[PDB]
Design a binder for this molecule. Structure first.
Ligand SMILES: Nc1ncnc2c1ncn2[C@@H]1O[C@H](COP(=O)(O)OP(=O)(O)O)[C@@H](O)[C@H]1O
Ligand SMILES: Nc1ncnc2c1ncn2[C@@H]1O[C@H](COP(=O)(O)OP(=O)(O)O)[C@@H](O)[C@H]1O
Ligand SMILES: Nc1ncnc2c1ncn2[C@@H]1O[C@H](COP(=O)(O)OP(=O)(O)O)[C@@H](O)[C@H]1O
Ligand SMILES: Nc1ncnc2c1ncn2[C@@H]1O[C@H](COP(=O)(O)OP(=O)(O)O)[C@@H](O)[C@H]1O
Lengths: 120, 439, 459, 438, 449
């Protein structure tokens, strides 16, 4: 391939001289006008707004943002660090007194909090 | 703004007396259709009271008889407080999932779970991070109105390191989860550097108290809880689609837990509406599923619209009224919308001209009403915009009859077009492909 | 955190909420009206034997057909069967339409639901120690190993629960779990005795005030005993064993973890896997450590199944482990969905129909319709004058049972809107005029769509 | 430049009053249809109205696509014009109603006026300021400059393998940066190295230029639906990992509309609704028109222009229903319909002369006559296709211009479908050894 | 060893002059067709021709497939014989014309000399060396490995590229192992432990192997047989590198892909280099498309272009059908079920029914092939079928009759054991009579229509 294609702006995503679009488009489509950036999410976090559920999914605005920008491999590496703490709660918060307790910010992770795999 | 003027922008509610449910001859943009509006208001009452699960209502009538307009008015009058899933039947023919799953999802979308929550969020501009090792540290945050120093635990200093928090950054800490998020940097630091990275954005400093305990109401679809439980980060599928034929045993768990939340009073179940437009584009396999779908306690009220006469059901070769199975129609009550009188057309065309900010002369509105009688509501409506633009081309103050006449000359109605198609049949590609291109 | 709502726990009413059972004597004879049913005494008695067939663990792979016109209570009877069995026995309802997945062959979708209808009940003992860590403390060994200088013979841990605390002496190998898990004093942990390892739930919320900021949520002290030894009974279906074997969930490698980040696409589970699952299940049944609890696969609108589904069901029903199948159909004599040259009764192939116990459901007399109107009204909470009852029941004779039941709520709205705490003829006469039946609407169509036209219906 | 089928069409050729000139902008005739298209142009440029439908209806070869490309040029490059055929929507990736949604949002533009501060120079210094901040020195032939770099743009500079003596390109505010090469002042640092040596930049080290950036609402969908470009490297695996289309939720597109309106209120972005043009609308099926019927009611939808050449024909996906244009009568009520008509012989003469001089061909008068005769008796599209072959034939006879000889040769080398059908009828009379296959 | 429909066929049974011996190599008759198949074998063995088409035409049971399998034996093992049915062409993964191209290139073989350039030894040292990267976030990276390899002829120390250390690491190599390193691919194999310190008391179930004899660096040469399709698949799904794409490409599920013409064309350039380098022999073979009437008009129209390729195998079609509707083209009927366009391209070898004495001969060849020792009256009985019934029904009776005879204690099959076989095991026609007579009316005991 000629460098005119492979290096000097025939790759639309690669910013530089000639490819004047890619530098603007990367900032605005991935950050400024990107719904997953924390400032945009924070404006949509109540009532009927499209991120209302994010209080009860266990992710923060930072983790949601990360998970929307990193690829499946990078996200899977991040999963390797985490502890399945909702599965341990299933062993401990058993009884009627425990009310099957769950942290309210993890309320919607029903199938993680109730799963035979942990008990078995 | 970004909302342009649409066909139903003038529809602002259902236009009934909230006491008697009696419609009035026009209000909230609607005109006529009184019995249909009264019936829609009776349905809207049992939507809002919410106890009656899984009723099905068909709005039946000719084209341009307010079936969609009444569905819009019902959604406006229902407000934002209740879910209103609006589904074209064409949307169910998904390639990524089966039609029954696509119906199940639309059903699940229409039941809200409502939760009210108070949580401590600390938000402010970072002034300094101080750290000691011998692990402990201290954090200074300001608003426009406060500054304070907070002791940070070891895990909190690690989180600060992982997030690369500097001074001049805006951070939020949800004290309930403990996780930091970085919102950006304070715009005061706009001069701090000459060049900035792609992922950096400036903000106004947070205002008021550093840590706030706002009370917030949350309403989420049952469909959202499903997709969130579909996979480890299923919430991303709420936006890309990108979801399977979700396992029924997941929904079984979710329904059981949402019942616990209602028993414990953690949540209020808010049953809403599914409106299936052009429901005659579904097929025999959809309809037979919908029969069982309406059996559930968690079934919304389903509204649907059809303009079909006696017509063949899809996925079969026999005909039936509305294009729907009689086995299905047995479970339905039907609302019928009628044609409009010239006086009701005259009103609707005035409402459209107001919404489009077009100043019709009285003669133009009269002529435009004749066209509405002779050529249909939608065509006369579409002449309003055309005559405004043509009037502007002559710099006219008001739309005169000559601007409607030229609009009528330039753009054919459906009947005049069908006449043109019949008159030129040999110059047009026939149903057997024959054409003659010559003069 | 969440602001609990104090309001009354009422319930929504659906088309079957009035049905509570089959309404049978201990002799199995149907009571003329009971448990929400009116009539169908034959079909209720037949379903009562089917109920006793299911509760007796001799049954495998029997078939039932509920046969009768629309509106004749076949779905009501299936739900009543389900209620007679209760929650401890699986009832798995589907339509024939749900079998046309895009994501696996439809014989897989049917075999999944076939195995969903088969339950397994496993009893095991959970045996743990749990608490907030009150202490960790090494016991120095009597005989230290040369060259190490440190040698611990025991690690002691204090665990407190809400109900007490215990001094716990643990094999020092737990150091590996504690150091990896980063257990600290004031953390909530459990010790499981089948490994001797430990897992950390979180920090005890007694310490939630240790700092102005710390980056973890706290968890309550365990409200049970410090030591749990409990039998635990696990509800399992055989379909759960299919999926748990065919897509393991906990795998810590990149391909597993990338897998669990992407949609959990169904797969055409092999018969080799299912047949080995059965063999290990039958082993544990013979050990007596598990009960098999076969339940009901109910397929409504079973005439939506095609001849490929029916021919697979032949093989499926012959399995030595299988639910009962209950079919419902209303399709007369009709063309088989996948065999356009073949017509048969119920839309069921004659090959397959010979396997089923057919139960017919008949129409309703005018007096039964009236009794159903009475049962439905009190279930919706509507209350009617007797002349309103008779007017609703008359539409039930002339039009349809379902239509009359659907008039109750609209008329109740109009009554209270008119200030009346009970519905009367004046409201029924108005509900019936806002909300047409299919026939009166079909007449409007037949008159208006006689041709093309500007205001015509589209044919 | 190349000459395609429509390159003679420069615009609608309307008077100041909006009346069509009988021959202007490379049109001849269709005056009533050009005037009607003029009002559609005004409708679009007013940007007041969502989702109005237009239909172009008339025989094949009557200029329905000239008119659609004339609109596209009356709107100019600013306003998005998105052309498709009705056959394009049968994607195998996603349901055809999703494909229609994506095409509606390609027809709505968003304009950002962006200032680019570019620093391009030889890296004279790289001084890490903290232990986060970098200071970088850059030099051109015309001076040197220092910049304070945020740790983010620093690590971008550091993820690229920039070193002192390298030549780099930086965009100050986008945070984009590129290593242009190694400065050739170091070209003799070794006698061979695997390195690319470039001259020092010879203009200003700093440039400021203003670029009016255009995106579309679909671009915002795609960027927000999934990680794009260098965010997703594992896409290199293909199969499951490649960037498949997915059936975007209206939750996403509604939440995108919220964010986009925010930047309109800040005055950063200008919204520009445009046009979705669907040619061969008769290739749409009953389920597509059923979707279009709803989608045209959304507050954002572009103006939709449709073309059809069908008479009364069955609609696709419902052979039981025959309708004019092949358009369901349900949906036809929603459309402003513009008829197009056949051309007079004298109009064919004028179109032949217009396109000849656009292909650069030049004709005798008798050569115009004979070509125009084929236009009347056979087809306008046939007679125009004669022009290029006849020019080649004249050229190889050494002639400067096409004459009757060169057309009478072209018309015998290159038959129309009509005479070709006559050959098929005479020769495919039987399935013999030299017969056409029936 | 197991006996199947064609185990008696050994070849075409031709003379050196190319005339057919009337009974040879397992055949009886078809002599003109066996002679035509001989000239096709000559067309294949003479490499010069590409993309010639042959059609074996003839009714079912006339030995068309026996002829094709006989060709496969006259060509021998060296030449690629690639058999498919027309029903194998409808893949769910890739378009059916992809499967045709894969089979066209599977029918062209290549024998190629390959030099493998390798290191072999006991690992005696292994010492990684690493760099502290700038803050990319993934931390430190191994910059190189130093590894010591010991063979019988002394030892060598290797400073490995870290890409090769990843092979060493994923191979779980340790000090004291014996390893093979292949410098062609950077790939690694742990051969075993040394036979040094080969004490018994490992739970690890190690294979201790002797120290490699010879020099620690070796350059062995081997001859590889591959098809063109093997190269296509290797280059479309790369897996021989140590790069991340090759690595992950071994973890992903294998799937077929619509390999482009662009790739196939550029592999022609690569293989022609091997020819010009003298390291490869091109050996074009034959594609047998059995049941070719199960192809469709898109398959046949693709085969036009595919056969015009400047390299293509010989294609042998077989069809058993008269004037029949072309599949995917219900408007078009033609002989053999082959489009009239495509039939013009082929040389048709028509194939004929057998005479009664040929059936007798085939029955005796088939009987002794199965080891069924069979009396002459029993032969005559079986050969009354094949005349009155299909030939296949004769051959299928031989095994039941053998079982019944041996159950009756006989050493050999009498007429009685066939007459019992005839009764237990019906032909299609007698069963078709049972249907029409029992299903003469519907009922509980009727056959289902
Ligand atoms: N009663 C009414 N009052 C006001 N506007 C109406 C009324 N009926 C119809 N319209 C308007 O006329 C147009 C066509 O009616 P609509 O209900 O959309 O068609 P359909 O009956 O086919 O659904 C829309 O712009 C709609 O808002
Ligand atoms: N015998 C009965 N007693 C009480 N309610 C009945 C009876 N039969 C039917 N119903 C009710 O009337 C309606 C019609 O019965 P359903 O089972 O839906 O008919 P189908 O089996 O044809 O679908 C349902 O609301 C059902 O609950
Ligand atoms: N009004 C016109 N004036 C000049 N040339 C025209 C006109 N209409 C069509 N043409 C020419 O004839 C060709 C055919 O017109 P086209 O729009 O493609 O017909 P349709 O799309 O209706 O089949 C075009 O490529 C163009 O070059
Ligand atoms: N000429 C022959 N000599 C010996 N055996 C034959 C001959 N022709 C056919 N057969 C055998 O008869 C059986 C049927 O022949 P087959 O090749 O299957 O016919 P077709 O393929 O045309 O249906 C096979 O066992 C085959 O080996």
């Amino acid at each position: 391939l000629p460098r005119l294609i492979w290096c000097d702006g025939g790759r639309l995503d690669k910013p530089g001289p000639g490819n004047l679009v890619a530098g603007f488009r990367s900032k605005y489509l991935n950050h400024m006008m990107n719904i997953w950036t924390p400032e945009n999410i924070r404006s949509s976090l109540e009532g009927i707004e499209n991120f209302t559920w994010l209080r009860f999914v266990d992710t923060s605005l930072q983790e949601a943002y990360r998970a929307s920008h990193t690829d499946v491999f990078a996200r899977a590496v991040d999963l390797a660090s985490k502890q399945n703490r909702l599965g341990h709660m299933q062993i401990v918060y058993d009884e009627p007194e425990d009310k099957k307790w769950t942290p309210v910010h993890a309320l919607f992770q029903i199938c993680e909090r109730e799963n035979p795999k942990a008990v078995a | 703004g970004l909302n342009l003027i649409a066909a139903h922008s003038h529809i602002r509610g259902l236009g009934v007396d909230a006491d008697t449910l009696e419609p009035r001859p026009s209000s909230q943009g609607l005109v006529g259709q009184e019995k249909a509006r009264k019936a829609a208001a009776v349905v809207l009452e049992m939507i809002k009271q919410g106890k009656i699960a899984g009723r099905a209502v068909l709005i039946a009538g000719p084209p341009s008889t307010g079936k969609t307009a009444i569905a819009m008015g019902m959604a406006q009058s229902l407000g934002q407080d209740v879910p209103f899933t609006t589904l074209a039947a064409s949307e169910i023919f998904s390639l990524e999932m089966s039609k029954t799953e696509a119906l199940t999802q639309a059903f699940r979308k229409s039941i809200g779970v409502r939760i009210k929550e108070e949580s401590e969020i600390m938000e402010g501009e970072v002034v300094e991070i101080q750290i000691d090792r011998s692990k402990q540290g201290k954090l200074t945050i300001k608003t426009t109105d406060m500054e304070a120093i907070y002791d940070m635990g070891s895990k909190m200093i690690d989180a600060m390191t992982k997030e690369r928090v500097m001074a001049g950054d805006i951070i939020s800490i949800d004290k309930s989860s403990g996780k930091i998020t970085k919102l950006g940097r304070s715009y005061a630091r706009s001069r701090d550097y000459d060049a900035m990275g792609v992922d950096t954005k400036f903000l106004q400093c947070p205002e008021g108290e550093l840590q706030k305990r706002k009370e917030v109401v949350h309403t989420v679809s049952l469909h959202e809880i499903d997709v969130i439980n579909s996979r480890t980060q299923g919430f991303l599928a709420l936006f890309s689609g990108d979801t399977g034929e979700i396992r029924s045993e997941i929904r079984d768990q979710i329904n059981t837990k949402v019942a616990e939340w209602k028993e414990e009073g953690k949540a209020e179940i808010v049953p809403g509406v599914l409106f299936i437009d052009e429901v005659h584009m579904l097929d025999i396999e959809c309809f037979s599923y919908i029969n069982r779908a309406l059996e559930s306690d968690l079934a919304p009220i389903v509204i649907m619209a059809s303009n079909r006469g006696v017509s063949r059901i899809r996925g079969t070769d026999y005909k039936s009224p509305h294009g729907l199975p009689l086995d299905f129609l047995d479970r339905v009550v039907i609302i019928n919308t009628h044609p409009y009188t010239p006086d009701e057309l005259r009103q609707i065309l005035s409402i459209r001209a107001q919404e489009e900010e077009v100043d019709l002369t009285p003669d133009a509105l009269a002529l435009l009403t004749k066209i509405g009688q002779e050529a249909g509501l939608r065509y006369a409506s579409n002449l309003i915009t055309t005559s405004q633009l043509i009037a502007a081309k002559r710099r006219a103050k008001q739309v005169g009859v000559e601007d409607v006449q030229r609009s009528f000359k330039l753009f054919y109605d459906p009947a005049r077009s069908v006449r043109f198609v019949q008159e030129s049949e040999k110059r047009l590609i026939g149903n057997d492909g024959v054409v003659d291109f010559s003069y | 955190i969440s602001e609990v709502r104090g309001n009354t726990r009422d319930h929504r009413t659906a088309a079957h909420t009035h049905i509570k059972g089959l309404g049978l004597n201990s002799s199995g004879i149907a009571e003329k009206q009971a448990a929400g049913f009116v009539g169908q005494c034959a079909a209720r008695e037949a379903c009562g034997v089917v109920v006793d067939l299911i509760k007796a663990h001799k049954m495998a792979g029997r078939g039932v057909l509920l046969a009768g016109g629309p509106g004749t209570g076949k779905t009501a009877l299936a739900l009543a069967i389900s209620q007679e069995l209760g929650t401890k026995i699986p009832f798995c309802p589907i339509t024939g339409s749900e079998i046309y997945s895009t994501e696996v062959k439809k014989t897989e979708v049917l075999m999944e639901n076939f195995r969903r209808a088969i339950g397994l009940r496993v009893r095991e003992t959970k045996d743990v120690y749990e608490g907030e860590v009150t202490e960790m403390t090494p016991e120095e060994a009597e005989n230290p190993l040369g060259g190490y200088g440190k040698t611990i013979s025991t690690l002691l841990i204090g665990l407190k629960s809400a109900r007490g605390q215990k001094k716990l002496r643990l094999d020092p190998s737990i150091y590996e779990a504690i150091q990896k898990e980063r257990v600290q004093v004031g953390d909530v942990i459990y010790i499981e005795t089948n490994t001797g390892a430990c897992k950390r739930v979180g920090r005890s919320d007694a310490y939630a005030t240790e700092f102005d900021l710390e980056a973890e949520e706290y968890v309550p002290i365990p409200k049970g005993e410090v030591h749990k030894k409990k039998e635990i009974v696990q509800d399992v279906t055989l379909h759960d064993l299919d999926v748990a074997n065919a897509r393991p969930q906990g795998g810590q490698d990149i391909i597993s973890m990338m897998g669990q980040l992407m949609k959990p696409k169904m797969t055409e589970i092999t018969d080799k896997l299912r047949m080995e699952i059965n063999k290990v299940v039958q082993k544990y049944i013979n050990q007596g450590v598990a009960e098999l609890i076969p339940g009901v696969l109910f397929i409504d609108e079973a005439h939506m199944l095609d001849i490929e589904c029916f021919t697979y069901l032949n093989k499926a029903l012959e399995s030595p482990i299988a639910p009962i199948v209950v079919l419902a159909s209303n399709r007369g004599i009709a063309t088989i969905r996948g065999a356009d040259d073949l017509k048969a009764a119920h839309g069921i192939p004659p090959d397959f129909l010979q396997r089923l116990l057919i139960i017919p459901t008949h129409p309703y007399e005018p007096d039964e319709i009236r009794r159903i109107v009475r049962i439905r009204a009190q279930t919706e909470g509507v209350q009617l004058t007797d002349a309103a009852v008779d007017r609703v029941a008359e539409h039930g004779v002339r039009i349809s049972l379902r239509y009359c039941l659907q008039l109750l709520a609209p008329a109740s709205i109009l009554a209270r809107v008119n200030g009346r705490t009970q519905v009367d003829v004046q409201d029924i006469a108005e509900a019936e005029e806002l909300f047409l039946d299919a026939r009166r609407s079909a007449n409007i169509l037949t008159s208006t769509g006689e041709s093309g036209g500007l205001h015509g219906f589209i044919s």
